[PDB]
Amino acid sequence: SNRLDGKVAIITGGTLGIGLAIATKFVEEGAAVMITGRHSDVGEKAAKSVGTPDQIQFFQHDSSDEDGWTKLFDATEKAFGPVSTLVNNAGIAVNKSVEETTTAEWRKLLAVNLDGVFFGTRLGIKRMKNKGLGASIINMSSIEGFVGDPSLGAYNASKGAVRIMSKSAALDCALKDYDVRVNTVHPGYIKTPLVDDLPGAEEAMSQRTKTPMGHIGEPNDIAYICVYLASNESKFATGSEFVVDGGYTAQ
Amino acid sequence: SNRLDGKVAIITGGTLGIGLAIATKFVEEGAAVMITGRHSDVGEKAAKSVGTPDQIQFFQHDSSDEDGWTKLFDATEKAFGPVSTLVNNAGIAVNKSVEETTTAEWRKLLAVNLDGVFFGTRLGIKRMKNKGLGASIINMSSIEGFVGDPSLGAYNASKGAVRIMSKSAALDCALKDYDVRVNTVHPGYIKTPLVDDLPGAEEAMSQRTKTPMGHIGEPNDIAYICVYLASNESKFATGSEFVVDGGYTAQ
Numbered sequence: 001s002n003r004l005d006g007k008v009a010i011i012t013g014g015t016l017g018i019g020l021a022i023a024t025k026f027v028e029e030g031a032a033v034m035i036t037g038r039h040s041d042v043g044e045k046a047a048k049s050v051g052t053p054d055q056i057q058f059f060q061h062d063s064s065d066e067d068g069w070t071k072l073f074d075a076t077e078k079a080f081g082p083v084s085t086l087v088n089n090a091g092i093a094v095n096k097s098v099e100e101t102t103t104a105e106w107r108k109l110l111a112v113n114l115d116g117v118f119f120g121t122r123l124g125i126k127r128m129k130n131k132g133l134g135a136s137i138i139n140m141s142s143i144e145g146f147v148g149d150p151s152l153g154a155y156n157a158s159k160g161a162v163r164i165m166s167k168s169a170a171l172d173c174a175l176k177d178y179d180v181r182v183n184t185v186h187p188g189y190i191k192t193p194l195v196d197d198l199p200g201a202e203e204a205m206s207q208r209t210k211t212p213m214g215h216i217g218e219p220n221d222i223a224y225i226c227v228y229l230a231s232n233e234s235k236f237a238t239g240s241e242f243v244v245d246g247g248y249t250a251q
Numbered sequence: 252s253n254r255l256d257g258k259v260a261i262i263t264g265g266t267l268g269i270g271l272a273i274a275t276k277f278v279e280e281g282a283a284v285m286i287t288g289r290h291s292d293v294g295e296k297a298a299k300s301v302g303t304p305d306q307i308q309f310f311q312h313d314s315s316d317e318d319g320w321t322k323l324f325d326a327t328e329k330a331f332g333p334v335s336t337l338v339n340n341a342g343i344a345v346n347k348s349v350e351e352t353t354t355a356e357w358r359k360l361l362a363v364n365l366d367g368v369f370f371g372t373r374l375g376i377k378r379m380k381n382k383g384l385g386a387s388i389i390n391m392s393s394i395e396g397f398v399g400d401p402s403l404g405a406y407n408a409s410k411g412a413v414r415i416m417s418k419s420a421a422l423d424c425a426l427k428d429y430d431v432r433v434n435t436v437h438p439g440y441i442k443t444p445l446v447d448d449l450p451g452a453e454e455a456m457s458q459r460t461k462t463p464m465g466h467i468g469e470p471n472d473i474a475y476i477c478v479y480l481a482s483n484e485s486k487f488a489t490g491s492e493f494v495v496d497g498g499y500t501a502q
């Protein structure tokens with residue numbers, strides 16, 4: 001289909017789940033991809049599973065590591081040429097209400113879910129602007145960027161932050177004619193091995209009072225909207241929020 | 252009209268502008284008030300200007316100071332009895348795009364605008380739940396919790412964070428029957444001495460492409476919605492955002 005002909009993408013947290021599905025579909029559509037993750041055993045196997053080194057490689061990185069972002073961009077460009085596309089997908093969760101969140105939990109979650117997305121967005125603008133690449137920054141979020149969950153307080157803070165920060169970046173890039181778009185993607189519940197590892201989680205998420213479709217999604221649901229946003233098909237979309245949630249936020 | 256009969260309020264950043272107007276109207280409506288600010292020269296004059304120590308006192312505090320929060324709730328309880336009402340109003344600005352934000356600027360602004368609001372909200376829930384106080388946490392925000400501004404990147408992140416974190420807190424308090432409401436307030440542009448000191452700032456904010464009313468607001472515009480939210484008049488309002496912006500976000 002070649003919908004991402006010539007694109008060079010970084011996908012943070014690309015070795016598992018949603019990130020891995022995005023990476024897989026990006027390679028299928030002609031993009032060269034650098035996936036990141038915390039563990040080199042998982043990451044090297046993930047890249048080889050998707051394609052050859054001319055298509056996809058792994059780079060070990062914690063998205064909260066500001067200095068490592070520079071090496072990540074350098075390694076990606078050395079492998080594949082100038083980066084056109086950044087998917088800020090790496091994220092973690094803390095299962096606590098605001099009331100029950102420790103300051104250590106707060107700082108750990110914000111380091112990945114907010115600081116890391118800031119570091120990637122800021123550096124991506126600088127490295128991606130003014131190169132005629134049709135550059136696109138896709139900031140992964142979730143339904144928790146729109147609605148509260150009583151037991152995801154810090155997570156809610158991080159997703160609301162990325163939702164509105166992304167609009168600021170989108171506007172600055174558009175007003176300055178940078179040729180960089182910035183958008184957010186908001187999955188509802190998505191089946192991954194990690195959800196499968198939590199007894200009863202999918203069953204609770206599939207209740208009609210949570211997901212009206214009565215089931216949860218799959219990683220390719222998020223990969224397909226990310227192909228659209230990375231592609232030049234979405235060249236007029238910037239500062240927007242794309243929800244794929246089985247009806248969660250419609251009620 | 253005694254709309255805040257018996258209430259005991261903490262107002263962070265209560266020595267200037269919006270915070271001082273909220274403190275003034277809260278005292279008029281029968282609340283006891285502890286205002287905070289950085290500077291004891293400003294804060295002691297401000298409290299004395301509003302009322303007697305039985306009505307209003309000052310407590311020196313940086314809202315980023317986690318231990319100081321414990322001291323502030325202790326001092327307010329000692330002065331006035333159990334705290335019923337918290338206005339998280341302290342905030343700062345950085346005039347930078349996401350691209351042009353330094354990490355130091357990012358961490359300085361989030362320390363006040365996000366961590367400080369988290370510290371206050373978390374402690375407020377713990378100290379005001381289950382006391383029959385009609386407790387209310389008002390998290391101050393702005394139009395930049397809804398829309399991007401290309402030159403307020405970190406500020407946008409902080410306001411989006413507080414917007415959705417406040418919904419999480421509202422839901423958990425409601426579900427647990429804590430008798431604590433949490434809401435956000437979103438001023439547009441407000442005339443203050445700080446705006447008056449920057450030639451042409453008010454004129455630019457008053458252009459119809461910014462504020463459709465063709466002028467900016469005043470601190471009492473925000474004080475009046477805060478009286479409503481602190482009062483038992485708003486006992487069914489929780490998890491909501493209240494915008495007072497001259498039409499800014501309507502276009």
Ligand SMILES: [Mg+2]
Binds near residue numbers: 052054
């Ligand atoms: Mg090949």
Ligand SMILES: [Mg+2]
Binds near residue numbers: 147248249250251
């Ligand atoms: Mg709903």
